[PDB]
Write a protein that binds this ligand. Structure first.
Ligand SMILES: CCCCCCCC/C=C\CCCCCCCC(=O)OC[C@H](COP(=O)(O)O[C@@H]1[C@H](O)[C@H](OP(=O)(O)O)[C@@H](O)[C@H](OP(=O)(O)O)[C@H]1O)OC(=O)CCCCCCC/C=C\CCCCCCCC
Ligand SMILES: CCCCCCCC/C=C\CCCCCCCC(=O)OC[C@H](COP(=O)(O)O[C@@H]1[C@H](O)[C@H](OP(=O)(O)O)[C@@H](O)[C@H](OP(=O)(O)O)[C@H]1O)OC(=O)CCCCCCC/C=C\CCCCCCCC
Ligand SMILES: Nc1nc(=O)c2ncn([C@@H]3O[C@@H]4COP(=O)(O)O[C@H]5[C@@H](O)[C@H](n6cnc7c(N)ncnc76)O[C@@H]5COP(=O)(O)O[C@@H]3[C@@H]4O)c2[nH]1
Ligand SMILES: Nc1nc(=O)c2ncn([C@@H]3O[C@@H]4COP(=O)(O)O[C@H]5[C@@H](O)[C@H](n6cnc7c(N)ncnc76)O[C@@H]5COP(=O)(O)O[C@@H]3[C@@H]4O)c2[nH]1
Ligand SMILES: CC(C)CCC[C@@H](C)[C@H]1CC[C@H]2[C@@H]3CC=C4C[C@@H](OC(=O)CCC(=O)O)CC[C@]4(C)[C@H]3CC[C@]12C
Ligand SMILES: CC(C)CCC[C@@H](C)[C@H]1CC[C@H]2[C@@H]3CC=C4C[C@@H](OC(=O)CCC(=O)O)CC[C@]4(C)[C@H]3CC[C@]12C
Ligand SMILES: COc1cc(C(=O)O)ccc1NCc1ccc(C2(C(C)(C)C)OCC(C)(C)CO2)cc1
Ligand SMILES: COc1cc(C(=O)O)ccc1NCc1ccc(C2(C(C)(C)C)OCC(C)(C)CO2)cc1
Lengths: 318, 318, 318, 318
């Protein structure tokens, strides 16, 4: 993650290592207590059986609702709703049968089932089924259940994938008729999601020079949809120090606008997290993208002091 | 919903009602079993205490990993990492104190703790904590952890919010300078996400007529970014029956492309679900949007024969 | 409430009457059970003592926080913080002393205090101190803890109190030089808080004619602050049917804007409730206001079908 | 805070920490009292059951009144009225079922129910359910049930959001057409709410210099509504030391007037608290407002001698 240190790296296997350490410590503790391994095995199996029964009860409770979306969300099939509510029915049934066998056999069952159902219903009604923020974040990053993922893939598929391949040609054509601009598209990634319309307001050293040859193409029923890129001059000590195609990442603006609107259910901490996730996902996409043949550079910064023109000049000279 | 029957409606309280029924049934069962209610209370409290201890152990395991992201996700505060892993530390600490006071004092604590830690470690190591698809979907829709949410908000914020307010003026200008175009933007929402770049390549009856005057505005460091719309003619039995500003929703293309790129981690079924969610979110946004003063229409359709021209004509003649 | 039937009337004494009925029924039930009145009195006094002790504990818990705002919110006085946390200290102390005396005397106390403290701490930590929506609404309306109250009083104090007294003069001056406008200012109160800028868009029968003589006045450091009122023509059957000074209530727009922004913590149901409360409060203000000498009329409507021009014409002719 | 030390900061978790300390102390006390923990659990559960029954009775009493507003506040749905009076009916019903199962079955239910109903009726009839001032303030600030909140959002939405973006242009125009006015709007926030209409009547050193070009725009059915600002000169020891666009915050006047009108139900202490809350809310709004690109300053002051001119000059020379 060379963009900015504030970008979090993907979660690793620290939880599994801590779980292994905990398992070893618990085995050592059980050994020290002197309790026989048979009692430990029996009670552990009973605990796992109770967990499976709770899973079944919660799955039935969730099925009560999911059967209302059977046609809209599950193609009108009960089997798919069951599979979504409680995982694979075969595995769940096997585990439930084993639980019943090893509970009724190993040193009442209807009372235990009633108690577990009462506890599960209490958790459901009191809203105790909530998941911790870290668990939610891990699940979303694993399954890519993030707005930033879609925003990055739309920025690449919709704009970069169609602009980077035909950027050096435009820059050349511009140079032949004029200008000493670089041969890359520079994208600004403010982690604060500011994204002003005119760069001069962000830093008066950014001075617009002129446009590149517009790129026209049919897009989703829009005839001759136009892509335009502006050439900007970076000044140092009052004179010209650079000239480049510079632009802000548009999706970040959307993120900022999603935090303002209440209907979006989007907060400012969520805004920062999703901005950093967008930057990381975009960096990941461009690395394995044949379109980005070194034709683009990403500049991510966290506004503390500094100068945006200085950032661009440092990324240009170096 | 109104866009299409296949659009799922937001989840309700069916699970809570099922939980209440289950709680009543369990209470009746315990009443009929003739067991001491005080024993029932003791064992329910013990079960909840065991759940709290398991939560603590899993939170420690997750903290072992989150502490590696203390400076990138939590701004260097150990309090924030603990809060993310264990929820509100005050509430969890109080629950742990109660669980210890009651388990260590009601009719060995260390052995139970070791067994619970062993079970939690086994669940973590073997990956048994995975949420069911329905639970993940409910969590994502409650917290809006979905790509479609961001895509819809980007479409409204970046395109519609700037186009619709200044749409009637362009239509009037074109009508004075040129046929009888319907004064509304008709947005096509193919749920299959099969968005061709040319409508005439989808259904021959739809034919490109002309283009509205371009709308230019500054956007995120790009000077005079141009938005263009296209007026099409609807050939009913070979004769122009109506004209409208027609276009597909661009974000759906991304959903189709994300389902084609492996690095996106996006499935076809996930693509369809996110398309339906995008349509629902866009409808909700435009319902409360002051910009949509009857300035746009959403046309959601699913191809089972089917003719897009008939859909557009039906939504026009209305 | 002649404005609109949807405007809720102020809460009455239904709760007190229901409480009296409940008290009578409970006395009848106690009489039927045959239990002696002395036991009832003793246990009722003990229950009230427990309630007082819980109040004291919650007050101490709240004091732990309020002492942090002693200087900012309580003028640096501990007595005021105590008075705010637990009401009048004299009454609270007397009730606590009576509780102690009638608990230790009437057929352990430290154990009971420990149990009550545990319960109060559990309620505080688990967030069980929440108040029901109806109770919150009643408390806010009693104490006028509503945004609509302030908005109505600002609309009256800031605009109407300075405009209505000098409205007939402006209308006269306008008529002498021209126009057959009425002699009152008509204010639109959409309960949906739509409030478009141009009335013609709301209903094309509303046609602006010309302005009234602007009213200038120094206001909070603004020299020659200007108040302008627009004259509008109401058409019926294509011809002129009325002419009046017509305008929307500006605060409603703010309410609508408060529901859009997430930082406002304002929902759409809150928007409707506060719009109706604003209308009721404004109606109450004008009735007892010498400034409103029949110089203004309020038109509140709920957009279902109907015509705003028809509403204004009906309020004019009748 | 930064505007003024007297501005209270938002309430934190001090009450929860105090509750946790109290819970620990009560657990230690019960441990030292040598009482059966099972008895402690039984009696705690009984106390919570009694609280739930009291909640049910009070909810019935409040429902008796709310059913009169079923069509004006709850759209004719008895479910909504019940939900408002009793919270989530499913959760409350489950809690009631548990309370009945445990009170009627643990070591007479009807007599306790009658006693609890009698106590609740006595509390309702005698008005003993009044929340303490600190609790009411915390609830109002958590739910933003305050007039100052609406006043601040109206000030930002109606005036600043439309003035600041188009403020530098007017200042530049005046500078070209006329002295060296500071390029920022300086807003005075007198916490005493003593807002005179003329600054020169407050401190002679502040003297009216000129007016900026008027800014006209359509607003809620009013054509060409004009916003005007005034440039003042700051006479330090009789010589112009600085110039700025200065003005009081108009809403504070309303707060002063509301404290003068009896029908407003607004007190002087409430006025001061709401003024401080208004300043805090305005600061928070402008912190995250993209319009405030260093285009305004908030000057909050309290008169203990004191000179406004010195305050303005100090905030200018900075
Ligand atoms: C001495 C001890 C005494 C004990 C005291 C006992 C009684 C005390 C109190 C209260 C009793 C409540 C009476 C209910 C009357 C409603 C009848 C009706 O008629 O209601 C029925 C209603 C049909 O309506 P509907 O057709 O409109 O369906 C709507 C749909 O549900 C919504 O779904 P969702 O809310 O988003 O999940 C959707 O959203 C909405 O649509 P939209 O959003 O557009 O409005 C509509 O479709 O539901 C049902 O049939 C299902 C209910 C049947 C199962 C019951 C749930 C579990 C509860 C209790 C059973 C266990 C027993 C324990 C009871 C605990 C109490 C202590
Ligand atoms: C076999 C059984 C074993 C049992 C297991 C026991 C241990 C298990 C687990 C965890 C132990 C936690 C270690 C805490 C380390 C923090 C030290 C520190 O150093 O923390 C101290 C910290 C000072 O910091 P600070 O100067 O920054 O003050 C901030 C202020 O509080 C914020 O106020 P607020 O949050 O809006 O309320 C404000 O907002 C913020 O400002 P800003 O917002 O700008 O950031 C700052 O001013 O607070 C304090 O001194 C007060 C804390 C002292 C009283 C303790 C609260 C009650 C808790 C426990 C006592 C009962 C015992 C039961 C424990 C239950 C556990 C089972
Ligand atoms: N039908 C249609 N005609 C248009 O002119 C248009 N312009 C934008 N959009 C769509 O609105 C949404 C908002 O775009 P945003 O700028 O926030 O992200 C955009 C933006 O960051 C970038 N991008 C796309 N087109 C341009 C462009 N012409 N110029 C600069 N950047 C662009 O790549 C992202 C995805 O664009 P599309 O995925 O093809 O559809 C967009 C998008 O879904 C349009 N849709
Ligand atoms: N300093 C200053 N100069 C101005 O030109 C100005 N214009 C508005 N405001 C303040 O912004 C806020 C928003 O006003 P809103 O229109 O939403 O409610 C306004 C509006 O409904 C009505 N009103 C006040 N002035 C006018 C006016 N000139 N024209 C029409 N309606 C007006 O009465 C309400 C209270 O106004 P003020 O309480 O005097 O201060 C306002 C207000 O605090 C101004 N403040
Ligand atoms: C863990 C549980 C079982 C017991 C914890 C009890 C206390 C020790 C807690 C309760 C309130 C906590 C405080 C609440 C809020 C803050 C502010 C927080 O802010 C910062 O200074 C850093 C924040 C950041 O960098 O984002 C630092 C931790 C602190 C002092 C916390 C420290 C620990 C406290 C005192
Ligand atoms: C009261 C407690 C103790 C038990 C209640 C259990 C059920 C009978 C509840 C749970 C969910 C409830 C439903 C949830 C939502 C709705 C939608 C609601 O919407 C409307 O049709 C009217 C809404 C309006 O007019 O605003 C009408 C009530 C109803 C059917 C409710 C009826 C009663 C239900 C089934
Ligand atoms: C919203 O409040 C909750 C939040 C959370 C969470 O944050 O996970 C969990 C549970 C919550 N409330 C339900 C509940 C709380 C406490 C108890 C209790 C008693 C106090 C009955 C004596 O039983 C035993 C115990 C040791 C487990 C804890 O104490 C039972 C049930
Ligand atoms: C979100 O959790 C809560 C919500 C609310 C609310 O909304 O009013 C209140 C309480 C909530 N949790 C705390 C809690 C404590 C105890 C019980 C319980 C047992 C489940 C012990 C068996 O004992 C006392 C009881 C019989 C009265 C009900 O059951 C339940 C819950």
């Amino acid at each position: 993650s060379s963009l900015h240190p504030s970008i979090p790296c993907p979660r690793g296997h620290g939880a599994q290592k801590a779980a292994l350490v905990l398992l070893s410590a618990c085995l050592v503790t059980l050994w020290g207590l002197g309790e026989p391994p048979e009692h430990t095995l029996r009670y552990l199996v009973l605990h796992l059986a109770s967990l499976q029964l709770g899973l079944l009860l919660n799955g039935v409770c969730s099925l009560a609702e999911e059967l209302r979306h059977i046609h809209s969300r599950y193609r009108g099939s009960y089997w798919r709703t069951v599979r979504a509510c409680l995982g694979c029915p075969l595995r769940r049934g096997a585990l439930l049968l084993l639980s019943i066998y090893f509970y009724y056999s190993l040193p009442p069952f209807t009372w235990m089932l009633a108690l577990l159902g009462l506890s599960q219903a209490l958790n459901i009604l009191l809203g105790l089924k909530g998941l911790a923020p870290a668990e939610i974040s891990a699940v979303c990053e694993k399954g890519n259940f993030n707005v930033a993922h879609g925003l990055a893939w739309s920025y690449y598929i919709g704009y970069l994938r169609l602009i980077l391949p035909e950027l050096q040609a435009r820059i050349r054509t511009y140079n032949q008729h004029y200008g000493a601009v670089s041969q890359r598209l520079y994208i600004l990634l403010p982690l604060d999601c500011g994204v002003p319309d005119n760069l001069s307001m962000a830093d008066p050293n950014i001075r617009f020079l002129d446009k590149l040859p517009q790129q026209t193409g049919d897009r989703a029923g829009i005839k001759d949809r136009v892509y335009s890129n502006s050439i900007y001059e970076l000044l140092e000590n009052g004179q010209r120090a650079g000239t480049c195609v510079l632009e802000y990442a548009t999706p970040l603006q959307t993120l900022f606008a999603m935090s303002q609107y209440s209907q979006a259910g989007f907060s400012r901490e969520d805004r920062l997290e999703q901005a950093k996730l967008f930057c990381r996902t975009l960096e990941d996409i461009l690395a394995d993208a044949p379109e980005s043949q070194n034709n683009c550079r990403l500049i991510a910064y966290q506004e503390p002091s500094f100068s945006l023109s200085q950032e661009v000049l440092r990324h240009l000279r170096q």
